[PDB]
Amino acid sequence: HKRRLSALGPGGLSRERAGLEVRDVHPSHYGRMCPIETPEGPNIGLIGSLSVYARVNPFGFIETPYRKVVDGVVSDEIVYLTADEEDRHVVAQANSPIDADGRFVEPRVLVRRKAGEVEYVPSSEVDYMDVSPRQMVSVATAMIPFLEHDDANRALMGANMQRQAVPLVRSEAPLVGTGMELRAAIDAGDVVVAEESGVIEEVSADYITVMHDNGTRRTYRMRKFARSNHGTCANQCPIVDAGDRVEAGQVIADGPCTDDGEMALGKNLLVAIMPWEGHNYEDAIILSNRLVEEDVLTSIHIEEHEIDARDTKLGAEEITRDIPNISDEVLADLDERGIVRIGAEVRDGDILVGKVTPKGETELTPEERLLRAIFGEKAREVRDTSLKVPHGESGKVIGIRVFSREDEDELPAGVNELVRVYVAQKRKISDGDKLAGRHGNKGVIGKILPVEDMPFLADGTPVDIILNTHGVPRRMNIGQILETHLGWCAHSGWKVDAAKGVPDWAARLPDELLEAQPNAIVSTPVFDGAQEAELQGLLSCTLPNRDGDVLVDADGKAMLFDGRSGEPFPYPVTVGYMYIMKLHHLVDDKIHARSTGPYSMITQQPLGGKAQFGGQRFGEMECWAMQAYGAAYTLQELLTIKSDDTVGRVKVYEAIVKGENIPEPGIPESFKVLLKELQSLCLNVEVLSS
């Protein structure tokens, strides 16, 4: 959200008045505005982000670094060029073969002309070369391995969802990544970085006292369990010990979605690509129960509720235990003055802040007068509006922040005591939660299977999740497959043979890569990554785990056993490790239902929105469809005695509770409003039967 570019707002063009051409990508966007990352809604092209290396001209333009090349020799004078002076010149690329002395070995080189043209230049006229690859790409898009193999659509979807991950309680780093996860996380702000080089004095879970190398000492107050702007947690755990020596610019405390300094937006899971039982039908995803058992996907959600004490004509709002008509058992968790105490587990619809308002006196109905005569109860004239926790929200109560007008706190006008309650819960994973890898392969959770009924590997390891095959080739996003093969390679660990020296596929493969320990972190840069030769040849030599167990062949597949039937599958199945995410489109944040709730004020329609109980808009095309069936009575039902028949709703509720026939639908309110407005507009509207 920082580093974000927008074309809409005051001064600039609006949304709907703007045409199609400004949504597109001119070739001047290259190196400046990322042609991948944008929202895919009704804002496409209007909202992009910067490139990695972009920088703003003091004239408000977007300058761009270039390695200038002189006489064929690439220099190291980095020149910040802007768009117009880009068109003055002609620029070669990062994948240009250098002779380690600047010079190109190709006589014919790829190059970019001013109008976006690409030629094979004779290798003398080029005056600028790119500073690196991936100069075109944004930050978040440059966190996707194998980008060059994915089509731009699913890559756009994956990069757009990658800002929608939630913080887990563990935050484990990926095996496979880019070179961006460290630098982007130290620029992220939510990582406590050791400012000055020194030595550790004393740690805690809340602060680290650092001992600087000359005199002074400094604490760093950790933010633990802070509520973010969308309910997600903001824990900051320290990662160093007491005798450690740190330096300036070093990570000293991980943040929400970080591990050991670098980014961690999810977990690493053993995945297979078989279609299983129709549960993974059309991007549906199944899981293991082990993700529930080990809390592998578990986020802490923190919701802050609020209620105020306010002045009125009839008196003043009062926060107390005196809350007329009610058991004493439901007033157990609250304190002496109405608010609950820290750690009290709440359900849906309980009492949080015991608060009552004065109401005054009206006439009593004589039946109520009889009942109060019988029971010896008073009128109890004050009316109770306590802060009740809304539907489907529960969990612990962490913290209470309370403000008071009498305690000289600043408050808005007419307000006497403002109390806020931090409610928190620890949501597990659940069928319906939205998961996605880093490639646009998204989907709800189809079925959380138990741990035994699972296609499991020959060692007895079960797979964790199972994607679908059929969604892969038609979406043109095989970077997930390359990530799967590379993930199994990195999990298993390898050491190629050098007995006849370097095998021919691993020639361009640089050193300290011929071996690898199991569960070692690797990184592919974005447009300089593993090639087909390197990945396949490294997949060929993939040393066994505990016994002599080459589990996965050279092809990348393996023989699975059905946990349900017991027979082996007749064909080898692609397996491996993919790094996936949990997204903030959870079920409880979207589940919504209503029998009878709040209505409107102006119209008599039911009020809508998940903040209320809320209704569902039976829209226009719905009316078209039910006309198309011809179900006229049910259309009458939906249009009249669920929306605006004010005298009809109560009689329908009564007839249901009595178990009787549903009565005739009366005249809706919205017609009568139209009738009164047309009468108000000096038009005698006449209604006639004959």
């Binding site: 990695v52 670094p65 994948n95 500073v131 690196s132 690859p133 300036a248 300094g261 690898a516 300089d528």
Partner: peptide, 27 residues
């Protein structure tokens, strides 16, 4: 690379870039 608290993540970088990533909140 060249950050004193960086864990040893190994790369497939064939090309050695001169320029490092800037201070991304400069904007």
């Amino acid at each position: 690379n060249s950050v004193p608290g960086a864990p040893n993540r190994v790369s497939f970088a064939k090309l050695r870039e001169p320029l490092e990533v800037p201070g991304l909140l400069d904007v």
